[PDB]
Ligand binder design. Structure first.
Ligand SMILES: *[C@@H]1O[C@H](CO)[C@@H](O[C@@H]2O[C@H](CO)[C@@H](O)[C@H](O)[C@H]2NC(C)=O)[C@H](O)[C@H]1NC(C)=O
Ligand SMILES: *[C@@H]1O[C@H](CO)[C@@H](O[C@@H]2O[C@H](CO)[C@@H](O)[C@H](O)[C@H]2NC(C)=O)[C@H](O)[C@H]1NC(C)=O
Ligand SMILES: *[C@@H]1O[C@H](CO)[C@@H](O[C@@H]2O[C@H](CO)[C@@H](O)[C@H](O)[C@H]2NC(C)=O)[C@H](O)[C@H]1NC(C)=O
Ligand SMILES: *[C@@H]1O[C@H](CO)[C@@H](O[C@@H]2O[C@H](CO)[C@@H](O)[C@H](O)[C@H]2NC(C)=O)[C@H](O)[C@H]1NC(C)=O
Ligand SMILES: *[C@@H]1O[C@H](CO)[C@@H](O)[C@H](O)[C@H]1NC(C)=O
Ligand SMILES: *[C@@H]1O[C@H](CO)[C@@H](O)[C@H](O)[C@H]1NC(C)=O
Ligand SMILES: *[C@@H]1O[C@H](CO)[C@@H](O)[C@H](O)[C@H]1NC(C)=O
Lengths: 75, 216, 226, 49
């Protein structure tokens, strides 16, 4: 079950097409994680969900509501 | 500069050339050999954390609308060009050309490969052009680019009516401005010096390290 | 409504901290690196450093000075480099902490003591207020931030012609729900009827691109009409 | 470098994603917006002022 990547020979992991959020970094854009019965999978890193913006020269979006979110920063 | 070349030198192979006799002698010196190895790894892992901080500041990947009607402004140069293999915009390409052994040192590849980075700078560019600052605070909100620039004047104390009356003139100044960036980057490399020094100082530092092997 | 959103917001912070310790990793890392480095420092003492024995008393006891010197001098040089390395480890790590301390001090001043308009300097979204909390060798901030929630589509236009004189918003945006024209504040949808109290005239229609015909109301006129 | 990276990260957030009133923190003159461009081991900003 050998997979070849630019980082080096990767053995004992299953290569897959579909991408997910990076979990354990290998380098050269390959991230590996534990997934379903379960095994170790190596996949191309997913940069995030794609979202085109419905832009046009006379369309504007105005929020109608708000959420007061509290987040934590540690130093 | 954001990151430097992720370099790792195996402590043992460098000092001792796979000589068991040399290796055993080294074990007397205690944990020097493992500290020096681990410290360099700490630099390598930190190094990827830099590019995460600089670029991965956007939760989604926005994509510019197919039709490039931005009130007269011309982001054709800085927006990604699908024709080239790597999804890199024209200015991004000029930079990449301007910027220019087996003793146990290895160069680990970066985590975000250059194609992937160009994706974020595509996103951050697309978000700015179609959402102003809003996409930073939360969900991206489309605003026609003419007004978004008009807001930004209202930020710096110039009332809106200045821009709308002068929309045609501002566009031409902006488009010619981008054009001037190409030539300064296209012809003169002195501007891009700061990135080159990180490569030069680092690459030089290895040469001193390797040359030391040939010292009695 | 805000109070309920704020109060529930604090509640979530506890559970995120109460059950999951991954949040406090960054403080935890500083403790480990120092404690781990110190352990290495002490461990180096038991390394013979190319001498007959790591224990000083042995080479002290078993051998008298003339040969003891050459053995001890190896130990001293070995220990000294180990201590030299540890200090340089601390000094470099000391600089990193200070850069974090000044960053914290800057946040404490610009983010707690006052509202700061620097974007994403104080947690994602527009910033309202910050509360500080102490922590082992650290400070933990609660950033109370305002985030727009439910967007909505509206057709818009730069300005309105009324009498050939172009009208711009004093503040806010010109939005139409499809059949009527309103001016609303930028970040929240509370459309109001368009009046000269909301708009300031400039120039004439022709210059501005995209301007849309509509009616601008004048409060003074119906009062003089009456 | 990491000192430079944080400065870039601060610049990215306060200069690209938003307009900033800090003088000369985003190029000479009043600031309007910034565009980021990738570079080998670095980031290049276009400051529109
Ligand atoms: C703005 O959003 C809030 C959501 O936080 C809405 O408040 C909720 O309203 C529903 C009614 O359908 C209640 O069941 C929820 O309990 C409310 N949330 C809270 C936290 O009390 C609010 O109605 C929205 N405002 C408008 C004008 O749509
Ligand atoms: C934006 O500006 C670019 C200039 O870089 C325009 O692209 C040029 O267009 C002319 C004709 O319109 C061609 O002769 C050039 O070969 C083009 N250059 C490149 C590099 O593609 C582009 O047309 C402009 N876009 C708009 C909408 O005006
Ligand atoms: C756009 O908003 C306006 C103002 O709220 C709407 O016009 C009002 O519609 C109500 C019925 O819902 C009538 O009772 C009022 O008399 C109307 N006001 C005026 C000044 O005509 C309009 O219907 C809305 N249009 C859409 C498509 O939502
Ligand atoms: C807005 O209303 C004005 C009328 O006040 C329109 O102006 C007309 O434009 C046409 C096209 O040149 C002329 O033939 C007419 O003589 C103009 N009217 C007047 C009274 O001079 C204008 O076209 C309207 N525009 C929109 C977008 O509604
Ligand atoms: C990815 O998909 C292609 C066809 O689209 C398929 O041939 C290939 O085997 C897939 N890769 C893996 C790892 O299954
Ligand atoms: C606004 O219209 C676009 C048109 O494609 C749509 O995708 C978008 O969801 C609409 N906005 C909302 C809030 O529904
Ligand atoms: C907006 O774009 C449309 C294309 O659908 C065009 O017909 C119209 O003239 C444009 N108006 C402005 C003000 O740019």
């Amino acid at each position: 079950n050998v997979f070849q990547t630019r980082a080096g020979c990767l053995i004992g992991a299953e290569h897959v097409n579909n991408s997910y959020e990076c979990d354990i970094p290998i380098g050269a854009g390959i991230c590996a994680s534990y997934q379903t019965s379960q095994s170790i999978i190596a996949y191309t890193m997913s940069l995030g969900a794609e979202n085109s913006v419905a832009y046009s020269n006379n369309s504007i979006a105005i929020p109608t509501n708000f959420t007061i979110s509290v987040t934590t920063e540690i130093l | 500069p954001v990151s430097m070349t992720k370099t790792s030198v195996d402590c043992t192979m460098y000092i001792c050339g796979d000589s068991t006799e040399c290796s055993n002698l080294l074990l007397q010196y205690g944990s020097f050999c493992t500290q020096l190895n681990r410290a360099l790894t700490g630099i390598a892992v930190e190094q990827d954390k830099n590019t995460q901080e600089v670029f991965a500041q956007v939760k989604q990947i926005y994509k510019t609308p197919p039709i490039k009607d931005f009130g007269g402004f011309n982001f054709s140069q800085i927006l990604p060009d699908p024709s080239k293999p790597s999804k890199r915009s024209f200015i991004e390409d000029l930079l990449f050309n301007k910027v220019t052994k087996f003793n146990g040192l290895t160069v680990l590849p970066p985590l975000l490969t250059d194609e992937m980075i160009a994706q974020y700078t595509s996103a951050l560019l697309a978000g700015t052009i179609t959402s102003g600052w809003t996409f930073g605070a939360g969900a991206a909100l489309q605003i026609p680019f003419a007004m978004q620039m008009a807001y930004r004047f209202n930020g710096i104390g110039v009332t809106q009516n200045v821009l709308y009356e002068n929309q045609k003139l501002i566009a031409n100044q902006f488009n010619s401005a981008i054009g001037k960036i190409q030539d300064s980057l296209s012809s003169t490399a002195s501007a891009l010096g700061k990135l080159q020094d990180v490569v030069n100082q680092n690459a030089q530092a290895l040469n001193t390290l390797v040359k030391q092997l040939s010292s009695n | 409504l805000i109070a309920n959103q704020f109060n529930s917001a604090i509640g979530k912070i506890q559970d995120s901290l109460s059950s999951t310790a991954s949040a406090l990793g960054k403080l935890q890392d500083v403790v480990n690196q120092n404690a781990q480095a110190l352990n290495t420092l002490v461990k180096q003492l038991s390394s013979n450093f190319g001498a007959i024995s790591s224990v000083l008393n042995d080479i002290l006891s078993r051998l008298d000075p003339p040969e003891a010197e050459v053995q001890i001098d190896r130990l001293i040089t070995g220990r000294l480099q180990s201590l030299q390395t540890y200090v340089t480890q601390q000094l470099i790590r000391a600089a990193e902490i200070r850069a974090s301390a000044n960053l914290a001090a800057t946040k404490m001043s610009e983010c707690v003591l006052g509202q700061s308009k620097r974007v994403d300097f104080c947690g994602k979204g527009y910033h309202l207020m910050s509360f500080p909390q102490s922590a082992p060798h650290g400070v933990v901030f609660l950033h109370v931030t305002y985030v727009p929630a439910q967007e909505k589509n509206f057709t818009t236009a730069p300005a309105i012609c009324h009498d050939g004189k172009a009208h711009f918003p004093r503040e806010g945006v010109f939005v139409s729900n499809g059949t009527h024209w309103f001016v609303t504040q930028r970040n929240f949808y509370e459309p109001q009827i368009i009046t000269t109290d909301n708009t300031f005239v400039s120039g004439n229609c022709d210059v501005v691109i995209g301007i849309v015909n509509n009616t601008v109301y004048d409060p003074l006129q119906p009062e003089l009409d009456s």
